[PDB]
Design a binder for this molecule. Structure first.
Ligand code: HEM
Ligand code: HEM
Ligand SMILES: [Xe]
Ligand SMILES: [Xe]
Lengths: 191, 191
């Protein structure tokens, strides 16, 4: 029901598999305990998803060199572009929470990588905009994406310890995903 | 006095400048306030640097697909490789704390990127080892590098809020650096 959202119906197999994923879970110190807590993160954020997106887009719109990546060629924000991506972004909050990180998940990670990269940016929504998001910012955004989240994890009044556990699980999953999304950016053989 | 440590004597200008740096700072939400806590972070960690490195190498050593990047071709850890890098790693804890992030700093960021990449890996210490560290792990390590650090920031018995501030400043600086280190990995024009 979400236009452009193709989880489980992607054209490509990811170039990484569940063996790659396990080693790389290990590199970010992600275990079964984080599965439980990322899932608990979802139940807690699910309600608040609108406010979260406003927090996030309000940080994005605040910074012209960041808003830039949603702009029409004339410099003005493409509002169709913003609204469509927003729906798919909101769904990723829940996917990160609720999906098995199996091969269909990996296939979508690869896809999300391709859509930030020049390979597939601007094709999902059929818009004219900047061709590529500099990978430097994909990495940088790990910070605000985790930050932005933490206050929201506190709002159903969970213990600070449980909030800390959901925040760490989230920090790890975001780091894990951004690391996968670098594939189409990274010189072949260097990934 | 630290062999291979060439901060301020690198042979290349970085391909990024202080204008690039200001916009990346902004992407990771790093401000003057973080300057004052990263500097505080240094005073707090300075003492404990031995123990920190043991924690970090003990995480590295316990994962064979991670230890791998310090191995001789026969699979055994190169001990002359580990010890030399350890000295330069320990200095980076203090550089991140104390340096002005100016052009000489950026030039060294580029260098550190080059040394993880095939471009320069294994030349500093004149060792034979694996040619390249897959960028996926540079990104992944943002997590353990921040997590490792947090307990150490608590040890001089600072209040949790000051500890929270030093930890965030550290999370941001590590994210900022790893984003810069991706340069030699990323397809030209995609950075
Ligand atoms: C932690 C880093 C990031 C996360 C977690 C993230 C998250 C997302 C998600 C979930 C989508 C929707 C994917 C889909 O189902 O189609 C998306 C698309 C997009 N994001 Fe990001 N993103 C990150 C970095 C960035 C950065 C640095 C920018 C620059 C402002 C950005 C701007 C965009 C744009 C323009 C699209 C649409 C791309 C296209 O045309 O398909 N993202 N992002
Ligand atoms: C947040 C991510 C990382 C940080 C903060 C970091 C930190 C450092 C530092 C400060 C140095 C010394 C640079 C110098 O002055 O020469 C170094 C070198 C090195 N690190 Fe990392 N590193 C990261 C990712 C990784 C990963 C994923 C590995 C894989 C185990 C790794 C293994 C190595 C190796 C093998 C060298 C020596 C490279 C050479 O031959 O010059 N690092 N790293
Ligand atoms: Xe977010
Ligand atoms: Xe560390």
């Amino acid at each position: 029901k979400i236009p452009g959202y193709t989880y489980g119906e992607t054209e490509n197999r990811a170039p990484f598999n569940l063996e790659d994923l396990k080693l790389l879970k290990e590199a970010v110190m992600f275990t079964a305990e984080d599965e439980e807590y990322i899932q608990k993160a979802g139940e807690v954020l699910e309600d608040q998803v609108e406010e979260i997106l406003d927090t996030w887009y309000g940080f994005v719109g605040s910074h012209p060199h960041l808003l830039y990546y949603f702009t029409s060629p004339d410099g003005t924000p493409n509002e169709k572009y913003l609204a469509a991506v927003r729906k798919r972004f909101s769904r990723w909050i829940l996917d990160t929470s609720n999906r098995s990180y199996d091969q269909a998940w990996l296939d979508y990670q690869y896809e999300i990588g391709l859509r930030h990269h020049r390979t597939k940016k601007n094709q999902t929504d059929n818009v004219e905009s900047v061709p590529n998001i500099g990978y430097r910012y994909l990495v940088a955004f790990i910070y605000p994406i985790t930050a932005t989240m933490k206050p929201f994890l506190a709002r159903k009044g969970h213990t600070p310890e449980e909030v800390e556990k959901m925040y760490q699980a989230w920090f790890k999953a975001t780091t894990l995903q951004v690391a996968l999304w670098s594939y189409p950016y990274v010189k072949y053989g260097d990934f």
